[PDB]
Each structure stands twice: as structure tokens, then as C-alpha cells.
């Protein structure tokens, strides 16, 4: 008669690493590292991102004529951008503080687009109908749908002076531009003034632009350029616009309800809803593990990215049956 004292063993080839030994089989194991995404751009908490499609941030925000389908996309969880957007800044030029604007917009949860200086009544002394071949829309000449190119009327170019008080109770983003013609002949033909200026001020903001005449390399068939500038108004502040030529007017502006936790993702993955509390450019992560090896740049409630193939722990016994 006898008693033997021992332990169980089973059919398992999972192994763990140790400090003294590299290949230990176990009877039970857990894995702390997540290595798989579902391939889809899911909605964090069920709220969709702004999908830019083929347009850039400077395309969407300016009203680039061809990214029209997104002008109604008020509620944002994050931004999804194509790796190589083509639609934006249709009239070539420099967009000032673009990276900073991108960051400020990324955190906005709600965009109320509104007319700030309405086209029909704000400029009775100027042409508000100028359009370009570069900002083509369905084959027809057009322009950004948040901006107005103001040129002379009846041989005159009366001075522009108007202002807006921020009564939106949100920060207001006002975008405008400055035209830099390729030739003094266009400067006169369009604005009737050889020495134009553009001046924009607020209680604390102050910038003067001095349009330059120069032939630049031709881009999208333009020899000149329109630079874009912007600033935000705090509630109660005022933006004052003054010019004697070359102002591309701030027809539309955005009242921004600021949030946090959002950001911008560059991805060519399709959208398909799941509650992806964590999301990478490659798709959703849906797990509770402390680490991931899926992607270093993530958004949402994510496992920490680690450069490791496996983080397996042993919970069971060393698996050696006899």
C-alpha cells in the first residue's frame, strides 16, 4: 500500500521564457501582449471621425470646391486622412501656421460653420463673383466655398473696412487670404492700386500684409499665389479687416467647440463600425491586455506599444508528464 505525492501534467506545448532557461513548457498560460487588429476604422465610443477622403486639412477647412461632401460633418471623434490627399489649397499658396491649425482643429468636437461676412450684402462696392480655372468644380471655374476674391467694380477699388464681433460663445476661426499677382498689370487690372495693403487686427492680434508682385513658378496654371492666414477670436473679441486691395475675404468662419482625446490618423483602411475603444491606422484593437505590438501611433483606450514579439506568463506548472 502506498501514497505518491505529485502534480498534474497535460497535452500543451505553450512555452515561456525565464531568466535562467529559455524554453519551459507549461500546463497553463496567459498572454499580456496584443498582436492583432480587425482591419477596420471603427468608431471610438460609436462617434465617427471626419473622413477627409481625398482632401487635406487645408482642403476641408477652406471649402475646397471638390471636398463638398464633408462640409456638413459637424460632430467629430477624430480625423482620418488619406496618405496622399490631392484636394486642398486649389489656388496655390502658403498656408500659415498649418501644423498649429491642424492641432487646434484635431481637438475640436463640434464645428458650426457660419457666414461671418455674407457675400451678397457685405461687398456692394466689389466684385464677389471672381472664379478660377484652378478651383475647378464639376468642370466649371469656381473658388473656395469659404472665401471671396474681391476685385474692382466700375473701374474703382473702394477701401474695405468691416468687422465682426464674436457673439458665438465659442472660439471663432477666421480664415482669409492675400493675393500676390504675377505682374503689376494684374495688380492694377484687378485692384486699381499699385501699393495695396491688407491689415487684420483684434484686441490682441495684429498683422499687416504687403502683397508682393512676382512671377513665381507656375502651379495649377497660376503664376501668382494666394497665401492663407488665420486667427481665433475669443468670445467678445472683434476681428477687424481693412484693405485697399488683394484681400481674399473671410466669407465663412467656424465656431469651434473645443474637446480633447482626439487626433489625426493617416490611413487607407475602410470604415466599419465597432466600439473600438482603441484604434490604430491599421484597424481596431479590442482587448484588455497591457501591451500591444500592433502600432506606435494610436488613438483611444490602448495597450502600450512595445517592441516585443511575445509577453507570455506561466500560470500553471512546468509541463513534464511521466
Amino acid at each position, epitope marked *: 500500500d502506498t501514497i505518491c505525492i505529485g502534480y498534474h501534467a497535460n497535452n500543451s506545448t505553450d512555452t515561456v521564457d525565464t531568466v535562467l532557461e529559455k524554453n519551459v513548457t507549461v500546463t497553463h498560460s496567459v498572454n499580456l501582449l496584443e498582436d492583432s487588429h480587425n482591419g477596420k476604422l471603427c468608431l471610438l465610443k460609436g462617434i465617427a471621425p471626419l473622413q477627409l477622403g481625398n482632401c487635406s486639412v487645408a482642403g476641408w477647412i477652406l471649402g475646397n470646391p471638390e471636398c463638398e461632401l464633408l462640409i456638413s460633418k459637424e460632430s467629430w471623434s477624430y480625423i482620418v486622412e488619406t496618405p496622399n490627399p490631392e484636394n486642398g489649397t486649389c489656388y496655390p499658396g502658403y498656408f500659415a501656421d498649418y501644423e498649429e491649425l491642424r492641432e487646434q482643429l484635431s481637438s475640436v468636437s463640434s464645428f458650426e460653420r457660419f457666414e461671418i461676412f455674407p457675400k451678397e450684402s457685405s461687398w456692394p462696392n466689389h466684385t464677389v463673383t471672381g472664379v478660377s480655372a484652378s478651383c475647378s468644380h464639376n468642370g466649371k471655374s469656381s473658388f473656395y466655398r469659404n472665401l471671396l476674391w474681391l476685385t474692382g*467694380k466700375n473701374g*474703382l477699388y473702394p477701401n474695405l473696412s468691416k468687422s465682426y464681433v464674436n457673439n458665438k460663445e465659442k472660439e471663432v476661426l477666421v480664415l482669409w487670404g492675400v493675393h500676390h499677382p504675377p505682374n503689376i498689370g494684374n495688380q492694377r487690372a484687378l485692384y486699381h492700386t499699385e501699393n495695396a495693403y491688407v491689415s487684420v487686427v483684434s484686441s490682441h492680434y495684429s498683422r499687416r500684409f504687403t502683397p508682393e508682385i512676382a512671377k513665381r513658378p507656375k502651379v495649377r496654371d497660376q503664376e501668382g499665389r494666394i497665401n492663407y492666414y488665420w486667427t481665433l477670436l475669443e468670445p467678445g473679441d472683434t476681428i477687424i479687416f481693412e484693405a485697399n486691395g488683394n484681400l481674399i475675404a473671410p466669407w465663412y468662419a467656424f465656431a469651434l467647440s473645443r474637446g480633447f482625446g482626439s487626433g489625426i490618423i493617416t490611413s487607407n483602411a475602410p470604415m466599419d463600425e465597432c466600439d473600438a475603444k482603441c484604434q490604430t491606422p491599421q484597424g481596431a484593437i479590442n482587448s484588455s491586455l497591457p501591451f500591444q505590438n500592433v502600432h506606435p501611433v494610436t488613438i483611444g483606450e490602448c495597450p502600450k506599444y512595445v517592441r516585443s514579439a511575445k509577453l507570455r506568463m506561466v500560470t500553471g506548472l512546468r509541463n513534464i508528464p511521466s
Partner: antibody
Amino acid sequence: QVQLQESGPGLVKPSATLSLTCTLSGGSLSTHYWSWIRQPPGKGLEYIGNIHYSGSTNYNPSLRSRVTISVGTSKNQFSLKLTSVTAADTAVYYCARDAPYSDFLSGVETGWFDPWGQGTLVIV
Amino acid sequence: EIVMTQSPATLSVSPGERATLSCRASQSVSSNLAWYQQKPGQAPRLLIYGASTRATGIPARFSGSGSGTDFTLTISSLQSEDFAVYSCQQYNNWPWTFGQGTKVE
């Protein structure tokens, strides 16, 4: 390349409004400003005014109280209307397109006209 | 309107030789002047805009220059189809206007 043709009454009495329509053949209004020009026999041309299809108009102030210019919904037609004809209006009316500013820019003025019709003579 | 007139109300040129016309404005029009041809039963045709630049399709035979109030209109040679009524347009003011026109025969 766009070509224009005027059509309407060749006779308008002083108590009546003169209404002439221009049809655009081989084209459409296309973001350009379109004009009416007048020429009484024995005289040079007189500028009446223009219109952009968007509803933007510019008139010679001397005729402002009597002239309106409008566009149709076919967007290949537009028309001139002169009220209270005074018989000083016994002139040839011409349809013309304002010249394009540039190959890559329109919707702005150039100050002169590039295609013209032959014009129609109206007797009062 | 800026009243503008043409002194050579009519020209008479038998050979296909050079002919000139002129326009004089009561007020400066800078370089904002256009020069047109007109024939009875024909559509008017633009020759020159901006005082000196030819319109597309216009022969090298038509040229001109000027500024302010004084403009010179040159036809290098008259072909039989160029014995047209000619006129200038001033677009440096509002309303825009035209001269009385001249007849070339």
C-alpha cells in the same frame, strides 16, 4: 467661338417696353458677364450694361431708370428690356460677351467685348 | 461718360496702303481703351484692347498705342474687307463709352 443672335419685335411703340432676347449658339452663359450695346443709325456705339448669370448687373447710369437686363433659366439666353420707349431708342441693339480676363480667370470684368451678334434694328 | 471723339471722321484710301485713325478723350483713360471694326449686317469685331494688344484672331496689320487722352490707331494696310467703320471704347470710368466712329472708304 460662342456665337450670338438677337430676336424680338422690330417695332415698339413709345407706351411699350422693348424686349429683346439673345440666344447663345454653341455655348452657354459660362460665368461671364454678358452685355447689351446700342447704335442709333448715324451714331457710334452706346454701352447699356451687363449681367452675370448669378444675378449681378451693371448699368449705364444714363439709362438706369429705364433699363433692366436679365437671364433665362436655359442659361443660353438673356434679354434686354427698355421701358418707356422715347423714340430716341430707334437703334440697332447688339448682344455681346464681355471679354474673358484670362484663360484661367473669369467672373471679373475686362471692360470690353469679344463676340458680337449682327444686331437687330428696332423702330419706334 | 468721358466724351471722346475722332477727328478723321472719314478716310478715303484707294490702294491697299496704310491708314490711320485717332481718338481723343476729355479725361484720361490711362491705357484702358479698345479699338473695334464694324460693318453693316456684320457682327462688330474687336481688334485691340488695352490700347495696344491684339485680340485673338486679329491680323498683325492692326496696331496702335497711346495713353491718357491721346490714342493712335494704325492699319498697316487696308484690305478690301477692312474698309469698315471703326470706333474706340473707353473703359477707365463708369459708364463706359465709345467715340462717334469713323468710316473708312
